[PDB]
Amino acid sequence: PSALTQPPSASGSLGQSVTISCTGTSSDVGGYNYVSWYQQHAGKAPKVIIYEVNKRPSGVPDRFSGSKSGNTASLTVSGLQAEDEADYYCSSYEGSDNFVFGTGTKVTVLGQPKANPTVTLFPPSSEELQANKATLVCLISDFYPGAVTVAWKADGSPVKAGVETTKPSKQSNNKYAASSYLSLTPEQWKSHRSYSCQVTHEGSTVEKTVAPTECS
Amino acid sequence: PSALTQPPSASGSLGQSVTISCTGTSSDVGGYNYVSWYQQHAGKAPKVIIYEVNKRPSGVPDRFSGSKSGNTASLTVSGLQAEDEADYYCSSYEGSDNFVFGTGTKVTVLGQPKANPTVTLFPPSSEELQANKATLVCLISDFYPGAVTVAWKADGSPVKAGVETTKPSKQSNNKYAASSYLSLTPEQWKSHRSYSCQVTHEGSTVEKTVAPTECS
Amino acid sequence: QXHXX
């Protein structure tokens, strides 16, 4: 399964050396060094910039580098160049028949100040409840770059179920808005204690929690 | 050399098909039997759907075939599910630890039905309200096709300012999701009879309202 | 894909 976890945004200025880690798990733990690093610009099919953890294919600018130990492979961009802005991925062969991919590090050559995400959690209103409908909305506003992660916990227990997340969208202030939503049932929302929207932005992580109350 | 000839779009419909070519030379396509095909949904993780000839990695959808013919390889999708509509890439060996990627193709189902958006409007959070922040959100879920138009309203007298909308994301199906905020203060919020998010989709207009009432 | 020897 795609057990190769990667940082969302990765960003820098022309010059500094942006790194892009990639983690995973199990089997022959870190016993496979089939880690391959790929760039892709927004309109292209994915260039392979590295492989066999430490290897670059014919040419590939010696400022792109690789590294790996335990559970973490890394791709350091030693001296960011303007056209280094792109999507970046990890890949690992789980065994024969198997190929595991990363989540992607959108790397941005910073135009603005790096903006840290405003997150706000809303629970299903009285009325929606009155309609046998349960939706929660985690508005994520104002980040830069538009590259975030969202994880929903129910009583701290990270549920992989009914939820979506919008794409980040350049607001009229060039900051990115997104939306993760969760769709529940007044039984399961009542039959619980707490609901977390855990949002992360390279080098940060919020978790705002809403608790079920009543009135009606 | 070339962008490995790949058609830039392919259509179909419910239970129709399409068959797509990875086209290059005797160095790569011609040469070695290993033709890999990718399923990468709009901007996200490329997925290995097939890797040599027609070698689907145990757990792959549908009448997903791969037949290599000449310098041309090809994938088949008989079971035009919406679940496809994607950027399908290929890639083959090139020798010397080199792999070149196909160029084109964004797969398009036709037939796909219209879905009118469920608009769920969210009054401000009490926690946020205590923070002296009043922010109203209009959720738009489920809708197909993809164009959606939103309006915010005070008591009519339209009222825009401090308003954001996000550009529609595909979801748990080729059904879309958008949102929208009103970053208000308590004074803009709490004075009025209500506020209202009016959403449109292929002629049809919804309207969603909120009154300072909240319950919990 | 990676693939291959």
Side-chain angles (χ1 to χ4, degrees):
Chain A
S2 270
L4 269 69
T5 6
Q6 251 180 287
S9 198
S11 307
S13 312
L14 298 198
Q16 11 108 323
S17 313
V18 44
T19 302
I20 313 154
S21 354
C22 152
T23 324
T25 225
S26 278
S27 290
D28 201 314
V29 205
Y32 242 25
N33 28 309
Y34 209 107
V35 177
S36 31
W37 272 102
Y38 328 74
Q39 57 153 233
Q40 88 169 109
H41 300 108
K44 136 228 225 184
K47 205 280 184 223
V48 44
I49 222 88
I50 257 183
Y51 59 106
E52 289 185 351
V53 321
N54 72 284
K55 273 81 160 55
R56 282 181 331 263
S58 227
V60 192
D62 200 10
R63 54 118 201 292
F64 294 67
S65 336
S67 289
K68 161 59 185 61
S69 288
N71 276 106
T72 318
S74 314
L75 171 89
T76 287
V77 187
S78 334
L80 246 192
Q81 310 281 328
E83 256 83 62
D84 295 345
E85 193 169 333
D87 294 295
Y88 282 78
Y89 290 105
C90 32
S91 222
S92 253
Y93 199 82
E94 160 158 50
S96 296
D97 26 76
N98 267 290
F99 345 69
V100 176
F101 230 57
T103 15
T105 325
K106 173 197 183 199
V107 189
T108 310
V109 180
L110 304 168
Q112 295 137 301
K114 157 273 302 183
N116 247 22
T118 308
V119 46
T120 47
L121 220 209
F122 306 25
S125 57
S126 41
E127 257 284 64
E128 206 199 339
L129 294 176
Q130 283 183 283
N132 74 190
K133 264 66 212 300
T135 296
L136 326 79
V137 162
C138 195
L139 194 221
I140 314 109
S141 59
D142 255 41
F143 39 135
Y144 172 68
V148 68
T149 306
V150 180
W152 290 86
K153 304 194 296 168
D155 310 3
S157 293
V159 70
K160 298 86 223 285
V163 37
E164 310 316 316
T165 308
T166 295
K167 278 282 277 58
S169 283
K170 157 198 179 98
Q171 316 151 193
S172 319
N173 63 357
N174 300 107
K175 309 260 188 143
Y176 300 81
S179 291
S180 310
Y181 85 67
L182 205 194
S183 279
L184 289 180
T185 293
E187 128 227 80
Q188 294 293 307
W189 154 253
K190 130 248 106 170
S191 74
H192 268 92
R193 205 193 317 137
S194 42
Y195 272 90
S196 297
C197 195
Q198 195 205 91
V199 183
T200 157
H201 200 245
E202 98 285 13
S204 275
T205 315
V206 202
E207 181 220 82
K208 281 176 179 90
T209 296
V210 116
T213 53
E214 212 234 314
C215 128
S216 89
Chain B
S2 338
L4 267 66
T5 321
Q6 214 177 280
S9 237
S11 25
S13 71
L14 177 158
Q16 202 198 287
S17 184
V18 94
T19 323
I20 321 152
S21 295
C22 196
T23 305
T25 57
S26 283
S27 352
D28 48 41
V29 209
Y32 340 61
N33 228 27
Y34 355 155
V35 195
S36 315
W37 286 85
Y38 292 77
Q39 213 318 347
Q40 93 112 228
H41 273 118
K44 61 145 251 262
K47 284 290 105 182
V48 168
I49 23 146
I50 250 117
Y51 66 103
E52 44 222 33
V53 200
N54 192 36
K55 258 210 201 275
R56 28 264 179 299
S58 276
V60 183
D62 198 79
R63 256 176 147 155
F64 270 162
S65 298
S67 322
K68 171 176 164 152
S69 339
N71 262 19
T72 213
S74 200
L75 172 86
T76 325
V77 52
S78 312
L80 254 36
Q81 330 122 106
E83 320 171 348
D84 312 317
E85 201 158 315
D87 283 273
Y88 280 88
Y89 297 121
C90 45
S91 204
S92 47
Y93 202 30
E94 184 165 63
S96 21
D97 302 74
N98 320 131
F99 303 76
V100 68
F101 289 89
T103 219
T105 9
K106 216 175 260 164
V107 131
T108 358
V109 208
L110 306 179
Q112 277 184 123
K114 200 212 86 160
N116 236 354
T118 75
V119 181
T120 294
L121 176 55
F122 293 92
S125 80
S126 336
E127 263 195 49
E128 94 169 290
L129 218 41
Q130 288 188 300
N132 174 85
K133 309 159 85 285
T135 308
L136 206 56
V137 89
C138 202
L139 178 67
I140 315 140
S141 348
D142 106 76
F143 60 99
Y144 191 88
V148 98
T149 258
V150 312
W152 277 95
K153 284 174 189 159
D155 289 61
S157 219
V159 133
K160 283 155 216 62
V163 60
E164 288 298 338
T165 305
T166 29
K167 329 275 77 279
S169 316
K170 49 115 178 100
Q171 80 201 166
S172 28
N173 46 159
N174 200 45
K175 297 297 203 207
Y176 312 87
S179 288
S180 266
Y181 61 85
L182 242 202
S183 338
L184 291 179
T185 53
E187 162 256 65
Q188 275 149 292
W189 136 251
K190 218 177 165 300
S191 36
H192 298 26
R193 208 303 268 168
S194 21
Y195 267 99
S196 286
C197 185
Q198 177 170 43
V199 172
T200 346
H201 188 78
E202 245 103 47
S204 346
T205 228
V206 192
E207 256 251 289
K208 213 26 71 145
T209 314
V210 51
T213 293
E214 95 177 88
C215 168
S216 265
Chain C
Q1 44 109 70
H3 61 56

